[PDB]
Assembly symmetry: D2
Homo-oligomer: 257 residues x 4
């Protein structure tokens, strides 16, 4: 495939519904050698199966909430992979209470901090921890959401976190560009996952989205997976600091009433 | 003036170079009744001085780094201003080490945290606290910067914080609109302030914008002042959750070579 | 008023519902000396009436569809206003057939042409003609619409014309800045004007924005009027080549469901 | 390849330097069946060789300046291809005089009209002429430039034309989406071509661009070709109405002084 000869790390695989699973399948199909990470123990088994299925025996625990965890993970990886070609950042979190009802009422200093820390800093934290291991032509990918561009009901603080994320890409793209490291982000529409079961009245969100979307259908972890694969391949050598919207063109329309 | 009868709380005045000083200046001119806060005891005296110059004697202290400091301040304000028409958020901060050299090499979890806390969270924090005190037709206003839109050397983390800031404006604007609260932001061009001091090659940064800026000059606190007075008046009763660029059209140009 | 001593040429007044009528209204209030043009003989009388109401007797004719009509008008203006401080461009047009149904099925080379000519080109056309007549500190201003930023049903071609318009503002702003000419645009929310009449389900379009708009109401010509007066005054001497959205923050929201 | 089983039309092949040549090579390599069009006779031979090299014997004359030419071209094509999967729009023109020196001075009603007609309308004109021939999952691609977003010296009117182009994509994406037709555009940085020899002081443009670009190098017709191939393949089924910047991240940086 067009990913043949690429060693890529994939974070965030929690279920077969995970956007990361979609990205992995695609990259694997496209010839990429993979590695996986799992947040905690309660996902060791699950992630270990997916990896096996994807022909990968590199599965490591790590928690972005802790530097050490990030440092240790890249420590083990360096044993099998002293040098790879980027990783996929499919990480984001926010205390439930924060994602329901009035934003001004919901938001808290703690919640605000946690959301930005995991959903944003986590990205540069990893890059920072593996800067010297990256090969020339390497690529970093991260997932975002329209919430970073507009005020969406209930998304609340995740919105600010995503806005911070998206700027991180521009700041990361500019800094590592000279070394030959591209940094981009995919803005995917709403998908069928576990975390969304987290956001309030998510399911109506979807329905509206698929009725009013140009392509008239919501995006799959497949649509997102392929764009991701391409974005991490040399095929996109010319693109960096970009946030391509993979939401079947939902954000560019208005009043499709 | 078109600000007559209005009661506005101004924050961020640290010196005569302060942007807020320019804002308070214009606002007072257009006839609004002002209130001033000051971060700490080191600043108290001077703010009290400017306060007097502007016919004000309401000079409360407030360190947005603390929720106790914010509640107590608004509790003190309610004593004389049981109700008021908004406030100008002119605060921003990040450890010095953060604004120098490689963004990825310079950034840290702690720095990222503080920048986002003092610079982004504080805005809503202040809103949350005074929500009930705001009259219909009230207007909140904060200051941002291009760093939010594009990767600017040395600006680093502050850029992410501003991105989060600007998202905040939109989320705040959408939540309080129905109650009659407008929220906007002014993305200002650089101005030699005490803060600018900490920023590397700022003096050089100012020089580049000047020659390449459409209006062939950098903006003044007077420029920002007049705009904030407008954005904070009933004259802009149709503008909300907007980020108006007051940088003499620097951002809309390219390769002015 | 903050417009005192200023001499502004206002175009586009067709009725009391006209946005320009709102602009002229506010401008006159803030004390600017006005000049009015009228497209044709069908309109002459009414414009002359409004002109009188606003202490003006300078009512020239101008059909931006012709370069001869533009030169002659400014030639007529120079008679009494050898020098002035800018003009408000409030013109837009496109064959009716263009604003109904499938954009691709509705569009035509001729329609595309006329929309772009009357709506986009005319702005610079008028600038080219009065360039030498503008005092330093002058300000040009045009009206645009969201259609420029996102595909809005039925708006069709006008959207492309507005996109070109907004680009014009930026290119015009960068070219005249050095001479001291500021150029900006107001992207206004819908308002029931004679023109709106031609637009399908506009009445329905207004209803959607109202309920989903942050400030829970659509803007008024008064709203636009106050903003244009500002953008056309020395108060905004730091804003150029900018497109300030005066739509009550409708555009910065999403799924207000 | 990932384009296997796709019939695609490629317009704008004038030289081996042409961006279109780059897109063709890539698509061919990726398994796509191709067709070519040439503006006039003076390019019949050249384009006929490239096509042969690319294993294509479908080469037709056509001129977007004329509907009939567009109608006739799709007439012949329909004989061999009664149904294909999109076409590549690599068309744009503007009278030289328009692309040099002061924009306000340079721009003319004629020049303005011609630029928009060929550089913008040409796109929907073709789509309009081949709507019924397109298969489900088809994709339309068009090339744009940062000039559509910022005021670049000398680009002048091409800027407005590109801005109109980019809106056309959103309006075209929204209208044909429901039929299963994606419409996107690639915003490529400056490249080594014939038309650029057209724009004034183009070569300094480049140099600045490659010195200040994150990836620290200008994009090739290869980088642009691959992104184009991907954009026209099912791999990007989730993306539409998008304008991905293929300029090595130049637009997202600032003051890389
Ligand atoms: N779900 C959607 O519709 C949608 C749309 C756009 C963007 N996104 C974004 O795409 C990414 C993927 O999310 P998803 O929808 O696949 O959800 P998911 O629950 O399947 O994946 C989220 C993952 O984050 C990981 N994670 C959370 N906190 C962590 C921490 N402290 N340390 C280490 N790992 C941690 C979890 O282990 C989990 O695998 C997120 O950034 C999400 O916001 C989702
Ligand atoms: N200076 C420029 O060129 C420029 C350009 C765009 C935006 N801005 C923004 O303008 C705003 C005002 O900054 P300035 O340039 O006037 O500098 P300044 O140094 O005059 O103002 C900074 C202020 O922040 C206050 N502050 C810091 N930490 C605080 C805390 N924890 N609690 C309470 N108050 C605290 C200080 O007391 C001080 O008054 C900032 O938000 C900055 O990002 C400045
Ligand atoms: N109405 C809205 O809700 C809304 C929202 C955003 C922007 N706008 C814009 O506001 C501007 C003013 O329109 P309006 O809503 O006030 O409608 P209107 O019908 O009151 O104004 C249109 C004007 O265009 C003038 N005009 C048309 N063709 C002309 C030509 N060839 N030469 C000279 N003058 C010509 C007419 O004489 C008329 O005064 C337009 O640019 C429109 O796109 C309107
Ligand atoms: N050259 C760059 O650096 C750059 C950067 C961004 C975008 N672009 C754009 O990419 C596209 C490709 O241009 P290029 O750089 O390959 O130049 P080019 O001269 O190689 O290609 C332009 C083509 O337009 C065709 N054309 C012009 N007028 C026509 C008409 N009336 N009818 C039919 N065909 C016509 C010509 O025949 C020619 O093949 C253009 O839209 C250009 O603006 C170029
Ligand atoms: O960002 C998302 C956007 C959408 Cl539409 C759906 C799911 C998303 O993902 C999350 C949402 C909230 C939290 Cl707390 C964590 C994650 Cl991963
Ligand atoms: O945001 C700014 C942008 C510019 Cl051009 C100049 C000064 C700015 O303001 C700051 C920069 C750094 C820190 Cl620590 C604090 C502040 Cl207030
Ligand atoms: O641009 C507009 C946007 C809106 Cl919401 C309402 C009216 C508008 O204005 C026009 C629409 C069509 C034509 Cl033919 C002429 C004009 Cl002035
Ligand atoms: O759009 C372009 C942008 C760049 Cl940087 C280089 C070349 C470009 O292409 C053109 C420029 C002017 C004309 Cl008249 C025609 C074309 Cl095809």
């Amino acid at each position: 495939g067009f990913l043949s000869g690429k060693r890529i790390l994939v974070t965030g695989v929690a279920s077969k519904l995970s956007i990361a699973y979609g990205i992995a399948q695609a990259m694997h199909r496209e010839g990429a050698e993979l590695a996986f990470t799992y947040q905690n123990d309660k996902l060791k088994g699950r992630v270990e199966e997916f990896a096996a299925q994807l022909g990968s025996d590199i599965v490591l625990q790590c928690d972005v909430a802790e530097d050490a965890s990030i440092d240790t993970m890249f420590a083990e990886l360096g044993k099998v992979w002293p040098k790879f070609d980027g990783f996929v950042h499919s990480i984001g979190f926010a205390p439930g209470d924060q994602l329901d009802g009035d934003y001004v009422n919901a938001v808290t200093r703690e919640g605000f901090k946690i959301a930005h820390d995991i959903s944003s800093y986590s990205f540069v934290a990893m890059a920072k921890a593996c800067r010297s291991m990256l090969n020339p032509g390497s690529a970093l990918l991260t997932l975002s959401y329209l919430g970073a561009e507009r005020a969406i009901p209930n998304y609340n603080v995740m919105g600010l976190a995503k806005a911070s994320l998206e700027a991180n890409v521009r700041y990361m793209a500019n800094a590592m560009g000279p070394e030959g490291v591209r940094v981009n982000a995919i803005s995917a529409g709403p998908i069928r996952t576990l975390a969304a079961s987290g956001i309030k009245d998510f399911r109506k969100m979807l329905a509206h989205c698929e009725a009013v979307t140009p392509i008239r259908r919501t995006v799959t972890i497949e649509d997102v997976g392929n764009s991701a694969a391409f974005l991490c391949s040399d095929l996109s050598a010319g693109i960096s600091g970009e946030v391509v919207h993979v939401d079947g063109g939902f954000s560019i329309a208005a009043m499709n009433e």
